[PDB]
Amino acid sequence: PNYALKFTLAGHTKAVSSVKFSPNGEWLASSSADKLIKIWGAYDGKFEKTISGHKLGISDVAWSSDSNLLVSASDDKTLKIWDVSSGKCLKTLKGHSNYVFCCNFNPQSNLIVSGSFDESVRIWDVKTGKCLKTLPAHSDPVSAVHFNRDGSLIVSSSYDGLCRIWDTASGQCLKTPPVSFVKFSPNGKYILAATLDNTLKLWDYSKGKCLKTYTGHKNEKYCIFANFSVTGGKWIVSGSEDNLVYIWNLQTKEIVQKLQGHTDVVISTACHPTENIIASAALENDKTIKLWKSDC
Ligand SMILES: COc1cc(Cn2nnc3c2CCc2c-3cc(Cn3ccnc3C)cc2C2CC2)ccc1C#N
């Protein structure tokens, strides 16, 4: 791949915590420690709107499947469901007793999953805003939560060193260095997990075996988003504490590109759903989002 910087997105006044493309590929949403959500054009980076209401910084944001809603996780111990068109807060999800770190819709987007520093995973009903289940998931802050492709499964990770798979319908656990990020692969059969020994590993969870290991980057202090890039060549994409975006060949485990430009830890990366486009975001010495594009 030949990812090249195309746009730098300026607006946040503190660290950018997460960037996520909308499923229709039209928009990029960003969350920040400055308590704001900002929406940008996915292809040109043009600022669109600021969405405000959280009383403390935001660690994560995520899109509903139809690209109409957002959910945000905030240090004010709540999540908020937003109507992106109107910018209005539809619901405020209360129940966590500490910072909410991570969040996601299920594919049907009738549920929300959240991970918190209170060490629980919570499952929320989008329509009523009610908390349906509270899982005593870990013995340390929860670093990531993600649904599989039909929402029947939740994968969570934690600084306690564990990665666990949960049955959404019952809340019960199906399967078990700090684990700082996890997410299901696009086909649903693998789990990409990051640990704070500068390592990413691809796990076949049905077999419970580690298939591939990716090294080269620096990840010892922060929880960093990683991604499967599938629009062109099959890559693993992740941020790094050396201010670079790393891209690995999924199959060969070779580093094939390092995207240079950010001036602080690259804490978030995201891959566009149909075009060879990467978005990346950095901590408070940088505060900008960058859009990178590749011919393949
Ligand atoms: C999750 O538990 C722990 C956390 C930490 C500190 N610490 N470590 N990483 C991040 C942070 C906080 C800062 C941050 C981080 C990570 C992200 C990226 N981000 C957000 C949601 N999900 C992800 C991968 C964003 C930010 C915000 C400044 C913008 C220390 C101990 C434990 C435990 N026990």
Residue numbers in the entry: 33 to 208, 215 to 334
Show the paper's wording:
Genetic and pharmacological evidence suggests that the nuclear scaffolding protein WD-repeat containing protein 5 (WDR5) is a therapeutic vulnerability of the CSC population. Previously reported WDR5 WIN-site inhibitors contain a tri-substituted amide core with an Arg-mimicking “S2” group, which penetrates to the bottom of the WD40-domain central cavity, and two additional “S4” and “S7” substituents that make interactions with pockets along the surface of WDR5 (chemical structures in **[Fig fig1]**, binding pose in **[Fig fig1]**). Herein, we report the structure-guided development of a novel series of triazole-based WDR5 WIN-site inhibitors designed to increase passive brain penetration. Herein, we describe a small series of WDR5 inhibitors containing a tricyclic triazole as a core amide isostere. These triazole-based inhibitors potently inhibit WDR5, maintain a conserved binding mode in the WIN-site, exhibit passive permeability, and, in some cases, improve brain penetration.
We prepared analogs with two distinct S4 groups: a low molecular weight cyclopropyl (**C3TD343**, K_i_ = 5.9 nM) and an elaborated trifluoromethyl pyrazole (**C3TD078**, K_i_ = 0.030 nM, **[Fig fig1]**). The triazole analogs **C3TD343** and **C3TD078** were found to have favorable permeability (MDCK P_app_ > 2) and measurable free fraction of ∼2%. Encouragingly, however, the triazole **C3TD343** was readily brain penetrant and displayed an order of magnitude higher rate of permeation than **C16** (K_in_ > 50 x 10^-^ mL/s/g, **[Fig fig2]**). At 100 mg/kg, **C3TD343** achieved a total brain C_max_ = 2.4 μM and AUC = 2.9 μM*hrs, yielding a moderate P:B = 0.25. In agreement with the *in vitro* CL_int_ values (**Table 1**), **C3TD343** was rapidly cleared from circulation, leading to less than four hours of brain exposure. The S4-truncated **C3TD343** does indeed cross the BBB, but like the other reportedly brain penetrant analog **HBI-2375**, it is too weak (K_i_ = 5 nM) to have pronounced functional effects in cells: a similar 2,700-fold shift would imply an unfeasible transcriptional IC_50_ > 13 µM, well above the brain exposures achievable with **C3TD343** (C_max_ = 2.4 µM at 100 mg/kg).
